[PDB]
Amino acid sequence: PPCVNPGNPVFSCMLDPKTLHTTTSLSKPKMIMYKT
Amino acid sequence: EDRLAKERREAKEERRQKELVENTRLGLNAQVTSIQAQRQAAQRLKEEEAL
Amino acid sequence: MRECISVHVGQAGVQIGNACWELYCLEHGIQPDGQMPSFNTFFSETGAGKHVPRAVFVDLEPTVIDEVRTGTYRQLFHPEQLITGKEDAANNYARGHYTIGKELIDLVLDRIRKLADQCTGLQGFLIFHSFGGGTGSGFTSLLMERLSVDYGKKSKLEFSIYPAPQVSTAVVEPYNSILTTHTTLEHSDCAFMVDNEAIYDICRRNLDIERPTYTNLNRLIGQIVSSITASLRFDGALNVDLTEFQTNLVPYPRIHFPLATYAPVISAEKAYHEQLSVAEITNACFEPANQMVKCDPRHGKYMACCLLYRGDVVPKDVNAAIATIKTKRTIQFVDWCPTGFKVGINYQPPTVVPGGDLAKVQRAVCMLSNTTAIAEAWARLDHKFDLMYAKRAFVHWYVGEGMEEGEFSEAREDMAALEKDYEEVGMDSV
Amino acid sequence: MRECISVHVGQAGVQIGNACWELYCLEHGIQPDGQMDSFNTFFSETGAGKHVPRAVFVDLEPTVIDEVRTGTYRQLFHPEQLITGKEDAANNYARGHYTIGKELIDLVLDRIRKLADQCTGLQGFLIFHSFGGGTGSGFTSLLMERLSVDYGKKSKLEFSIYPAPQVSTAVVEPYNSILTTHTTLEHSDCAFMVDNEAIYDICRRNLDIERPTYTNLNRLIGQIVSSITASLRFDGALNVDLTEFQTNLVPYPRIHFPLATYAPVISAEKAYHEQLSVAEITNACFEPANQMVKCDPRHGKYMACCLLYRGDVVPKDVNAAIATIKTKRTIQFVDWCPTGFKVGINYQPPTVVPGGDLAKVQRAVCMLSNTTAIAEAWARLDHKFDLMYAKRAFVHWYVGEGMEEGEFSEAREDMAALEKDYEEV
Amino acid sequence: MREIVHLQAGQCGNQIGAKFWEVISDEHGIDPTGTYHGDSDLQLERINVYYNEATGGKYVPRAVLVDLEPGTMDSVRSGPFGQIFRPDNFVFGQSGAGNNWAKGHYTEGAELVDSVLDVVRKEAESCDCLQGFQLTHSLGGGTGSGMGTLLISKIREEYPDRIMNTFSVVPSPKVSDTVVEPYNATLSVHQLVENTDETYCIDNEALYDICFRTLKLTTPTYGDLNHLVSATMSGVTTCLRFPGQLNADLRKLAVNMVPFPRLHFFMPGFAPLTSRGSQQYRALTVPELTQQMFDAKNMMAACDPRHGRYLTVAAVFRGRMSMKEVDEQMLNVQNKNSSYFVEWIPNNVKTAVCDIPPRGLKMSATFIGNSTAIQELFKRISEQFTAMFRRKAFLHWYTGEGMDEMEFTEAESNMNDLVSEYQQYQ
Amino acid sequence: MREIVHLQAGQCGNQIGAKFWEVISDEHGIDPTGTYHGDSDLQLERINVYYNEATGGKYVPRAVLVDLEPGTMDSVRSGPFGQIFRPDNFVFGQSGAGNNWAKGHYTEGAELVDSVLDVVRKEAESCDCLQGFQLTHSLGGGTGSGMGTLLISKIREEYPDRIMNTFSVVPSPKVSDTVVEPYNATLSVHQLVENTDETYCIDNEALYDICFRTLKLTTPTYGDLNHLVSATMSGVTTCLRFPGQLNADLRKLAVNMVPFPRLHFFMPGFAPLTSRGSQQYRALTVPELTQQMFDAKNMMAACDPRHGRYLTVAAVFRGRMSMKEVDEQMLNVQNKNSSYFVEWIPNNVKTAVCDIPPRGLKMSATFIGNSTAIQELFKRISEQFTAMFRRKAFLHWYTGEGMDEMEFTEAESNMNDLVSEYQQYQDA
Numbered sequence A: 001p002p003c004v005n006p007g008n009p010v011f012s013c014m015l016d017p018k019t020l021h022t023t024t025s026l027s028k029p030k031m032i033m034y035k036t
Numbered sequence B: 001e002d003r004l005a006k007e008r009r010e011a012k013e014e015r016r017q018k019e020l021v022e023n024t025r026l027g028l029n030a031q032v033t034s035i036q037a038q039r040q041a042a043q044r045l046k047e048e049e050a051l
Numbered sequence C: 001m002r003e004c005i006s007v008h009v010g011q012a013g014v015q016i017g018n019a020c021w022e023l024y025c026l027e028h029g030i031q032p033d034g035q036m037p038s039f040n041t042f043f044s045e046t047g048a049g050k051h052v053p054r055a056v057f058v059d060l061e062p063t064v065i066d067e068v069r070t071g072t073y074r075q076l077f078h079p080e081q082l083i084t085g086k087e088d089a090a091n092n093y094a095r096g097h098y099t100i101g102k103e104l105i106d107l108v109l110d111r112i113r114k115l116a117d118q119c120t121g122l123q124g125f126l127i128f129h130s131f132g133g134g135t136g137s138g139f140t141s142l143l144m145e146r147l148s149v150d151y152g153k154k155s156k157l158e159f160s161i162y163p164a165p166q167v168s169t170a171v172v173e174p175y176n177s178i179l180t181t182h183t184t185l186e187h188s189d190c191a192f193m194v195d196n197e198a199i200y201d202i203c204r205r206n207l208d209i210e211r212p213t214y215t216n217l218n219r220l221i222g223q224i225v226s227s228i229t230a231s232l233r234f235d236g237a238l239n240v241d242l243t244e245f246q247t248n249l250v251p252y253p254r255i256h257f258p259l260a261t262y263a264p265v266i267s268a269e270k271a272y273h274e275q276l277s278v279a280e281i282t283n284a285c286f287e288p289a290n291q292m293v294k295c296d297p298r299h300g301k302y303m304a305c306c307l308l309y310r311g312d313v314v315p316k317d318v319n320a321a322i323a324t325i326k327t328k329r330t331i332q333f334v335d336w337c338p339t340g341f342k343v344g345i346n347y348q349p350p351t352v353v354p355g356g357d358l359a360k361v362q363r364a365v366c367m368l369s370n371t372t373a374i375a376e377a378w379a380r381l382d383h384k385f386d387l388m389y390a391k392r393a394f395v396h397w398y399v400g401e402g403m404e405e406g407e408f409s410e411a412r413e414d415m416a417a418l419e420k421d422y423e424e425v426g427m428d429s430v
Numbered sequence D: 001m002r003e004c005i006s007v008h009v010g011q012a013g014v015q016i017g018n019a020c021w022e023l024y025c026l027e028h029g030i031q032p033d034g035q036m037d038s039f040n041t042f043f044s045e046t047g048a049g050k051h052v053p054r055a056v057f058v059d060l061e062p063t064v065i066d067e068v069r070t071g072t073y074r075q076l077f078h079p080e081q082l083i084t085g086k087e088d089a090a091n092n093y094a095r096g097h098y099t100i101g102k103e104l105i106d107l108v109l110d111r112i113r114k115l116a117d118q119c120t121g122l123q124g125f126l127i128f129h130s131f132g133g134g135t136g137s138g139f140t141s142l143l144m145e146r147l148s149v150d151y152g153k154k155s156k157l158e159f160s161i162y163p164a165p166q167v168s169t170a171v172v173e174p175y176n177s178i179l180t181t182h183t184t185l186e187h188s189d190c191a192f193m194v195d196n197e198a199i200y201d202i203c204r205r206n207l208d209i210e211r212p213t214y215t216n217l218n219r220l221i222g223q224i225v226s227s228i229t230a231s232l233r234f235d236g237a238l239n240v241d242l243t244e245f246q247t248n249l250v251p252y253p254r255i256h257f258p259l260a261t262y263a264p265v266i267s268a269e270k271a272y273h274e275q276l277s278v279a280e281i282t283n284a285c286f287e288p289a290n291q292m293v294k295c296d297p298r299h300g301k302y303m304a305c306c307l308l309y310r311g312d313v314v315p316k317d318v319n320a321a322i323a324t325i326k327t328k329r330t331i332q333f334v335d336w337c338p339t340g341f342k343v344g345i346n347y348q349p350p351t352v353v354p355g356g357d358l359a360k361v362q363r364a365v366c367m368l369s370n371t372t373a374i375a376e377a378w379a380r381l382d383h384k385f386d387l388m389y390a391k392r393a394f395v396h397w398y399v400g401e402g403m404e405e406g407e408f409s410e411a412r413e414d415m416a417a418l419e420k421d422y423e424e425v
Numbered sequence E: 001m002r003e004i005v006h007l008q009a010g011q012c013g014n015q016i017g018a019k020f021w022e023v024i025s026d027e028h029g030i031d032p033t034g035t036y037h038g039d040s041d042l043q044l045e046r047i048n049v050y051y052n053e054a055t056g057g058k059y060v061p062r063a064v065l066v067d068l069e070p071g072t073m074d075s076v077r078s079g080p081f082g083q084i085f086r087p088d089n090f091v092f093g094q095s096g097a098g099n100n101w102a103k104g105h106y107t108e109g110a111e112l113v114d115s116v117l118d119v120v121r122k123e124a125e126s127c128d129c130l131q132g133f134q135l136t137h138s139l140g141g142g143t144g145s146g147m148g149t150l151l152i153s154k155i156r157e158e159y160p161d162r163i164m165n166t167f168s169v170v171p172s173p174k175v176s177d178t179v180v181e182p183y184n185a186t187l188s189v190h191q192l193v194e195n196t197d198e199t200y201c202i203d204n205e206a207l208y209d210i211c212f213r214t215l216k217l218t219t220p221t222y223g224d225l226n227h228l229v230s231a232t233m234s235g236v237t238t239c240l241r242f243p244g245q246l247n248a249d250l251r252k253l254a255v256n257m258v259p260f261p262r263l264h265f266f267m268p269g270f271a272p273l274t275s276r277g278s279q280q281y282r283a284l285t286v287p288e289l290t291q292q293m294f295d296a297k298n299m300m301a302a303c304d305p306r307h308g309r310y311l312t313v314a315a316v317f318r319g320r321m322s323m324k325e326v327d328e329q330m331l332n333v334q335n336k337n338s339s340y341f342v343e344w345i346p347n348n349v350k351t352a353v354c355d356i357p358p359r360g361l362k363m364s365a366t367f368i369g370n371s372t373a374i375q376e377l378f379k380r381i382s383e384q385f386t387a388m389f390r391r392k393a394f395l396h397w398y399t400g401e402g403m404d405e406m407e408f409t410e411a412e413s414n415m416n417d418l419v420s421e422y423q424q425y426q
Numbered sequence F: 001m002r003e004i005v006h007l008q009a010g011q012c013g014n015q016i017g018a019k020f021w022e023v024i025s026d027e028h029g030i031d032p033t034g035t036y037h038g039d040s041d042l043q044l045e046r047i048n049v050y051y052n053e054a055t056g057g058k059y060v061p062r063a064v065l066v067d068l069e070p071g072t073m074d075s076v077r078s079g080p081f082g083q084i085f086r087p088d089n090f091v092f093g094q095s096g097a098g099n100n101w102a103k104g105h106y107t108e109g110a111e112l113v114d115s116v117l118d119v120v121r122k123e124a125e126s127c128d129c130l131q132g133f134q135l136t137h138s139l140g141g142g143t144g145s146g147m148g149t150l151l152i153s154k155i156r157e158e159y160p161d162r163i164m165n166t167f168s169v170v171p172s173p174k175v176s177d178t179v180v181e182p183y184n185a186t187l188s189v190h191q192l193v194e195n196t197d198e199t200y201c202i203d204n205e206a207l208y209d210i211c212f213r214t215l216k217l218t219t220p221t222y223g224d225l226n227h228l229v230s231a232t233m234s235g236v237t238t239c240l241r242f243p244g245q246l247n248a249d250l251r252k253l254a255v256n257m258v259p260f261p262r263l264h265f266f267m268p269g270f271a272p273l274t275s276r277g278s279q280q281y282r283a284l285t286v287p288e289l290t291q292q293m294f295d296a297k298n299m300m301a302a303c304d305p306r307h308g309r310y311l312t313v314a315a316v317f318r319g320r321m322s323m324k325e326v327d328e329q330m331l332n333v334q335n336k337n338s339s340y341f342v343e344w345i346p347n348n349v350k351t352a353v354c355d356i357p358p359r360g361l362k363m364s365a366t367f368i369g370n371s372t373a374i375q376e377l378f379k380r381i382s383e384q385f386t387a388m389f390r391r392k393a394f395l396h397w398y399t400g401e402g403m404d405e406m407e408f409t410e411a412e413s414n415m416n417d418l419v420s421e422y423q424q425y426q427d428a
Ligand SMILES: Nc1nc2c(ncn2[C@@H]2O[C@H](COP(=O)(O)OP(=O)(O)OP(=O)(O)O)[C@@H](O)[C@H]2O)c(=O)[nH]1
Pocket: C009, C010, C011, C012, C013, C015, C016, C060, C061, C088, C089, C090, C091, C130, C132, C133, C134, C135, C136, C137, C161, C168, C169, C196, C214, C215, C217, C218, C221
């Protein structure tokens, strides 16, 4: 798990970040945590 | 998911607290059994003095 | 890098130290031969895989020190760091400072220079003595001159056993407390004070035990010194080193007598019955029954208090517990010193020794404070010194033992000016 | 959040304390080693799992808590809390209040301060005292008078053991009765009455337990204290906390010594026959062969009615019952409060303890009717204290143990004012 | 785009805040864990009126309910819906009031009204456009009357323009279960009548009387009495939840039944609801409905307008219905008498029709019949409060928390004023 | 390419920094031994702002650590992330301070200050184009307050125009955790009001109020409290760490929100904070953040701003959000509460958005508010200081080893003017 310490008071994440993405018919798959 | 992470961390800390309670029980039970042993030794010496 | 040297003087200093090192050799897993199959603050590593504690035992009588060298600890201790004598002081400051101690000072200082040569970063001493007898007044005052001319800025913190009001052992103890309070006022950096009769008054009531001996008492006094020094080696959230206590409890150099009280002294049978949180235990040291002082501080006012905690104590539950205790009208502060408090938290739970009447409860606090109420304790003692000196009752040995009669009248003016200094403090400033 | 301390004082204080704690200790799952949070009003969790009761008692004849160190519940009741001396008081307000009571007040108040400093959400204390003893009167009075300035506005209630009109235990029991009614007129928030002679009459006549004991009497006191203060742990359709009692119970500040009744005392052999419906048995809090301390409110005037209920209680049936009680004109409500009632409803039905004969009933009935017929009782007690303080019966022991003789006649002439306050209506 | 923040006051308010929030949360189809489970299109119309939009799409009732004693938040959390009311807003203190209006108003009621007004102004900023509030509350209690009136005193000056109705809970005449409540219920109506926009009479005796004579439940509860109050007050907020043919939402009821602005105490009632033995022999039609409508034994308060006079009478309706026989069967009872049918009022009819019915039934109605017998409610109290004010009943508790002796005379002096204000049209 | 040099001070300073580098690392995605293994390269394109590079991709945090007591300096070397700071930078003290401030300033403060300056100029030479300095300390101790005041006094000789922040721990108003604390605290601020271009204020009991009320954590230790404040000190220095739609670094936050150069005492708070109960429940849109930051309850310095008025406020918005929504929802905090906002400034709020949120969240935000509420704080210590000076309580621990009694009275005049400075601008 990619956590500093699980269940710290301010927010944390445990999903594998390589899998959260969604593409369009006219674009490549881009990751949603780092879309600017 | 972070909801679940907080809930399971609280459960882990509760487990450690119950461990602490059991080891306090361990120490106090050992101490009181040794205390009973010295009490019985005192009664033995009282019998020997009587004889 | 944080080596501290404990030196024990007198019978009461060394009999405390016999039970003191028993605690320190068990919180570190040390066999009493000395081996071990961050401890360098109190122990010294040799080249042979062997630990030796950094300490010096000094006494003027062989009859108390020979049981140390044929006991169950005779090989853990260094063969030379235990120091002896041949002619007893016999309860006399004139004999413990002018006759005997002048022939046994040149070697005790010789060793403690070498026992500080193992170190690089020394910050504290610990002198253990009692204010009842000769070597515990005469010899302990002689060295405080000698450590001061050699070291200076090293903060030497002490432990003292006061002569209680009601009970006593000697009849020349009220001389020897005042006659050392002159010399040990300029040359001491703190002074911890716990009397016998308020360990006696506690030990009857909160513990089930009645009729004790000093081996049960020194398991408390050994525990109170280990509760102070535990923050040096065990990591905690709020650690307080030994050199900190000087600037927080001594407002004025004339007033350096704080007091001690250790809260959860409950029976191992009666450790079962009460929850021991931190909010239950920061109030219990202020209970009039539970102090180790036979001066009720309700007669006075709390100057400054330092608190130190051990084991599973959390800093959220101690800030809420300490704010309540000054909201009540029972516990008294006034304007000129309104903060008063500092805390100490440690992660080492207090251990138990076999035969100890304590229990392995995980939240233990020692209370470290000075009050206004000590001034009425001396108000007996300067008075009791004057019932004897009004017909010069027991100075007749003292004049023949190397000091003149001139220091006794000087002991009046120095001690009587101390009593007026307390009532300067207690009167409100408007 | 609503933690309580129930301090019961006297030899009555200790024995009613442990039988009421017996019925508590069986209605929740207490095994006498403490191991098993609705209990948490009366119990205290430890760091070792133990549920220690929050209840110190007062008894100075040490021969009563020289038992409770042993027995069945030796590890259950914690005896560092239960406090006894080594020199008894023996029918003496002087010894109880300031002579032998001068030195344990430190320990008792220090312990109460330490427990209520451990706690967070107190509201007040429950108190039962016996009028006619040595320490159940005097050190009790010292407890009230010193706690009223140590804490102040935390409540203290009392539902006192009072002398019977005819048969009594000590000889001169009215002296200590008056010397505690002057102080419970001052520092008691509430004070009802329950005495042993009326329990004798009721348990003798209806249940078939002839030859009873104070233990059986203690059991019935446990049943009434459960059906009074049962709602801090057991939820209800229309419940009640402790503070509502002091808020709604008593009209005047100097008038808080009225009565009650408890109807359903029916055996198992009569309970297998009689149906016990909330309508048709709640009228037995008014029938003359049932009452709780020996006085008849048919002679008097009904003042107020704190009804308390447990079990299979219906709001429709309690309202029809209250209606058909308020119909028949034995109800004498003069204009000052026509409405009167207070209703408490509790889900959890009362608990069978082995040792009584009152079987498990499916639903219950209570009463606390404030009354007006206390006046003849206190006036009879006036009559016989005047019979006894014309010739100064036992005064020398009280005087020589450390007071003046004006204490007696300053405690009296308050009581004539008390019955003037009671004869005002 | 109006949305609602709510107010129900007491443990009785928390008890009403159990079953009142049953019927509304049932009909817009939300499970006891939040996510949508309805089966139509009207059931996702405007359900941001009561419910916020959480993360994950979860719908939380924007409501505040008040108590101070800590043991009353859990027996409403033992219900099935304890995970849909977020209990952040369900407030309680360390010390409770306990039948004491002064304790919950000045002592810590004033100390914790800072807390409840730091959250009701916190969520009303998130609302883009509010609508108002809506209340029921018991009176004979301490916090629900006390902090409840402290709410509606500390809000009619900060937010005076918004509309905040009430329908309070005053208790029965002949059997009354906490009887020093004229210190609690008649103090508050002096506070209430210059604050609120409406207040009606939900009498427990009238709720008791239905399961006696009408629904034939042998052994009822308050819970099935609390059933009958969300079966009525749903009809007052029927149009912001259901689209209509001729709709009357919260403000139209706020503007069309207030003639004289101090006079908003009327007598609510409920016409249709009969037993399960009378379920076989009953149609869903207006003329068979009209027999069980105007009787002297079917209402929601226990005061009869046979003594009284019909001033402001309303009728909201459910169902896609024949809307000339609404008008035909309402004029066959305005054309029958001249004792109750006051000729001075020319005609007062307030008609609303809504399409989608309550869940489980097809047609219904609702009614209110106004009277001068809400005057005779307070006429009786005007010789029950005077009984225990001349003789100083519990007042020695009351002066200890910072109040006057004349405040009880002055609130009684307003009570004799408004009773005198009802008799001018009588 | 422009970067910040971290530097800590004291046992409280070291324990903060051990959980500041614990939370900046795996937001950049760094293993416990110092090799980048994160997912996207967008966190890699300006990793040099808080990090430094070495042979074979082994990254080195560039923080300069000083402490006088070596018994707690080793506590962070034995932590999980203790093996990434290069052990040349550990500057230990051989003996402790003793909580007297002038020991940390004159006697045993001046002994180490040659060495601590040796590692920063060695590091600052290796910097490319340095921007600012970052400091954490507590006011309450001679290890933290005394050491830092000697560092910041003569770092303005060498680096005058470098933008310095210090993140103090002001003593709590209810219980201050040292007896002779306010001598140290009042003497610290005189080196603070002239040197530091910005300073922050973290009350220790206001963070206790958060675990009392908002989070309602059962058992919060200092590991939990340091994590709650370390997120706040990451939000400030972020718009130069990631791209954004309207960015604002440290210089733009400073010159846009202090009005006068000796009026810079700040008051921070961090917006999205939710308990485990309410987290299933809670709304997440942009006005739900304006509830959090402008709640006076969620404010990690003790004084409520209802007793005073704001001058300028700051609000950086880490997230991918609509610009109008922020701008529309900032006037609607000014309008309904216009009595807590002064009149000779037209608009008060400062706007900043950064696209990349904290790792996982949708949006997050940080509030920094310059208030006149803090004079109600600063009036407290000045009264608290006079109660121990007039009767000369605990005097000789400072007089006989350092400066004389004038420095106390000078520090009164440096303190009394500021409280009069706040009040004069409270109603202009
Ligand atoms: N707490 C404690 N006090 C002790 C102990 N042993 C002796 N004392 C105290 O010491 C006092 C008497 O002084 P001592 O220490 O025995 O005599 P001394 O100071 O060694 O002087 P000399 O015996 O002549 O060398 C008595 O009042 C005791 O209270 C001990 O083991 N523990």
